Design an enzyme around this catalytic site. Structure first.
Site, short mmCIF file in Angstrom:
data_model
loop_
_atom_site.label_atom_id
_atom_site.label_comp_id
_atom_site.label_asym_id
_atom_site.label_seq_id
_atom_site.Cartn_x
_atom_site.Cartn_y
_atom_site.Cartn_z
N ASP A 92 -14.23 52.96 -22.32
CA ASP A 92 -14.91 52.84 -23.31
C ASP A 92 -15.67 51.39 -23.43
OD1 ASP A 92 -16.25 52.95 -26.04
OD2 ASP A 92 -14.51 52.99 -27.02
N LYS A 94 -18.93 50.40 -23.44
CA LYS A 94 -20.17 50.30 -24.18
C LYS A 94 -21.19 49.44 -23.68
CE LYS A 94 -18.50 51.76 -29.00
NZ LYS A 94 -16.88 52.29 -28.53
N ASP A 97 -26.42 45.99 -21.79
CA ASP A 97 -27.42 44.73 -21.25
C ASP A 97 -28.52 45.42 -20.65
OD1 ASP A 97 -27.83 42.14 -20.40
OD2 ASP A 97 -25.69 41.67 -20.92
NA NA Z 1 -30.37 39.90 -22.67
NA NA Z 2 -16.56 54.16 -31.07
#
Ligand code: NA
Ligand code: NA
Lengths: 259, 259
Positions: A92, A94, A97
């Site tokens: 997880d 996430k 970028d």
């Molecule tokens: Na950036």
């Molecule tokens: Na979450």
């Protein structure tokens, strides 16, 4: 809405991603649509939880950047358990970028996430470059990705047109993207999985913006596929009986929705 | 727009955050508003870059999850350089989870980011719980945070009401939040810093959605405070002369905007 297909039938869909089909077939074999959020800071506890709860779960979700004693050999032992008990490993992370950066964060550094994670997730806020960058690592490694279309937390901005953009990005990157983290069903296409965190049997939340709904609400009323459960299980005295309670809740909600 | 104050005068504002004031005073002392994005995978190269370029930069931005040989002693050596050459360390972690999780990711795991990073950044998509959770670690450690209000990449969803929400969240958490990652000036309050990535002297982009604007555009026309420069410097043969080119560009754009 189109007539609901079983997990086993969805595993066979023409456009299904191989990782999604592996997941769907083990969900139907094991009668589980529960993902354990293994939110612990000790490798021993992560591995003891994975072994004991493995039979009850379709997926084990990790935050390896919270493991005080992470090593790649811990992840090797987790893979052995995943293979023995038949569940996928979902990191997880996430990712959120620009594409050039996430590529490195996925393959490289200390964690080498792509080497052991069947699934990862990404926020769609940077635009589709985030998916492009991850897929340049993930496709050769036969991995899948979930896009975060909605969040469970108070004040979430992943609503409306943002959610629509996530669904569009998933559609357009279906070779790599296998589904969503969302609070409900956001795509009408049955090839996509929906996984939903913020789940407990009892009403409530935490003081840092987490909000809870029950398995029956999330799977039965909101049409999601899999519940992600963390503290509801982890904080319980008997984590195995907790996982069984969540498994039976989510499975029956699914069956009753399937008709 | 209100009359522009110098960096040195902003460092004295009644509501200024201590980390922001330390930054602003070293920017004016050293005549630099350049943040080096030290995007390398080797600790030796990170440390050699930090030493050589230290005098030219106000800040060194890290992605420690891309360092193949990260150890906490590498970060100790980076801190020594930061103190010797006077720059802040900014870990570009883009925290983006629920508050309870980011708290752990900031303090804990292998990286112990809060132990060495003056600044971190966060996406606002989860709602203000993300800030709440980080601040429960960061406030006792006297750290600051930047909220990502806009992104440089193609297809970015950090626009319109999303950007407005980021500014509101920063205002409301000013004890911890010191400014923004943004493409332009998004707040009219001079206590807040604006840092802008996606910067090169020449026009262009990459094939994974990065888009570039020049220091004169970003600082002079769009009213940002600091340029974040990665490949424009890192890929150059002479990284010191590259950093000097970027420093002089950003500093003069600032001076000409200041009048
Ligand atoms: Na950036
Ligand atoms: Na979450």
């Amino acid at each position: 809405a189109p007539k609901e297909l079983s997990f086993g039938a969805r595993a066979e869909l023409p456009r299904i991603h191989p990782v999604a089909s592996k997941l769907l077939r083990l969900m139907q074999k094991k009668e589980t649509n529960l993902c354990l959020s293994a939110d612990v800071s000790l490798a021993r506890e992560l591995l003891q939880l994975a072994d004991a709860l493995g039979p009850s779960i379709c997926m084990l979700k990790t935050h390896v950047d919270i493991l005080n004693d992470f090593t790649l050999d811990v992840m090797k032992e987790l893979i052995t358990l995943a293979k023995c008990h038949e569940f996928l490993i979902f990191e997880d992370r996430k990712f959120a970028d620009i594409g050039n950066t996430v590529k490195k964060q996925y393959e490289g550094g200390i964690f080498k996430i792509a080497s052991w994670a069947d699934l990862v997730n990404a926020h769609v806020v940077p635009g589709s470059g985030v998916v492009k960058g991850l897929q340049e690592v993930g496709l050769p490694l036969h991995r899948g990705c979930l896009l975060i279309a909605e969040m469970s937390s108070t004040g979430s901005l992943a609503t409306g047109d943002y959610t629509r953009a996530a669904v569009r990005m998933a559609e357009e990157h279906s070779e790599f993207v296998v589904g969503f983290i969302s609070g409900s069903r956001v795509s009408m296409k049955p090839e996509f999985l929906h996984l939903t965190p913020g789940v407990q049997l009892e009403a409530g939340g935490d003081n840092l913006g987490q909000q809870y709904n029950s398995p029956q609400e999330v799977i039965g009323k909101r049409g999601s596929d899999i519940i992600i459960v963390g503290r509801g299980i982890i904080s319980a005295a008997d984590r195995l009986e907790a996982a069984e309670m969540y498994r039976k809740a989510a499975w029956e909600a699914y069956l009753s929705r399937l008709g």
